[PDB]
Amino acid sequence: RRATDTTPPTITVPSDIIAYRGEEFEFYFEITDDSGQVKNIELSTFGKPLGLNWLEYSEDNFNVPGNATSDNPLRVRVHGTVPLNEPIPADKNRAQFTRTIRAWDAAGNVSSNITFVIKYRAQTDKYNPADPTITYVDRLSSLSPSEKNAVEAAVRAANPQIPAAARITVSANGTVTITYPDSSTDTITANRVVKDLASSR
Amino acid sequence: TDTTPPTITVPSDIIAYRGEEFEFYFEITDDSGQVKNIELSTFGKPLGLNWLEYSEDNFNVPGNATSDNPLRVRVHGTVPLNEPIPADKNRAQFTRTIRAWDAAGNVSSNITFVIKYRAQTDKYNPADPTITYVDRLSSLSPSEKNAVEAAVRAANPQIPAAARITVSANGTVTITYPDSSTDTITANRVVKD
Ligand SMILES: [Ca+2]
Ligand SMILES: [Ca+2]
Ligand SMILES: [Ca+2]
Ligand SMILES: [Ca+2]
Ligand SMILES: [Ca+2]
Ligand SMILES: [Ca+2]
């Protein structure tokens, strides 16, 4: 047996972190140490400030004997919400944050930073609207207020998976726009939404 | 023997809104206590309001039309949703006549009544919603617009469910009634920062 612990902790990072603007998400780091005890972690930008004030984790169970064994690793839950307005550039391969994590054991050994990547995307990437039941209208090019209400209700009823804070609008010819809370959108063309009532009876 | 026709009281303010059922009553009395029938016309010519109907309950019965208990004729109908409204609202009305007769056949003169009709927004007057607090007053988010609309709807169960409430970028509310007339709620009664 060696008189001292000279080996830093080992960190496992999640391999495919995907976040949608305005929606809470979470991912876990798993950490072990040959001593069985991890003291704390640091999230950084390769040693510089993290710069993501919306990302949080709990220090529950940090620096407790036995908290970080091979059989029972330390599981660190990181969570937050990418801001509703976070800019997504034209090349969506650039819509990500690459950051680093390291950890200390109780003997002062600190691991070397390893990377993790938070990819983020518009809410319209998460949601795929189903077509509503058809609303039958008197004039295909000039919907009444009651017909627009019915279209919106039908679009909403065909899509309970879509967020309640998304806003559904309807044009004069029955074209549907779904505007998600982050202002990304989805469209349903009118021919999938309305049909002429007289033509259909 | 009866030589005197019935007398007719008409309502003074018959005001109907497009697309919304209305009702009113004529009250008819005769010195005999009995009214046989009535006729609605355009000064003797055809009435020309196929959307108007009246009840003939209790016509031509003794005692149906006394001073104490006149014959109360219920009239109802719905002015068409698309009835055009002239720019001069003194012309947005139908002037018609009613006459009535007793069992001896004494007929009254034609008595005038006027059905005024108006756009739905002339009826409805939106109450204000609980205020919605927003992040930017010139650029509401989708979620904030949803909240504004829900609040306007929750405060106004009396407005037709078929009316459509829209919300602009600055929180201005438009209510479009089924007959396509509108009301507006200015942003300051609707949103705050
Ligand atoms: Ca160690
Ligand atoms: Ca989508
Ligand atoms: Ca008489
Ligand atoms: Ca009676
Ligand atoms: Ca009004
Ligand atoms: Ca009024």
Ligand SMILES: [Ca+2]
């Ligand atoms: Ca709506």
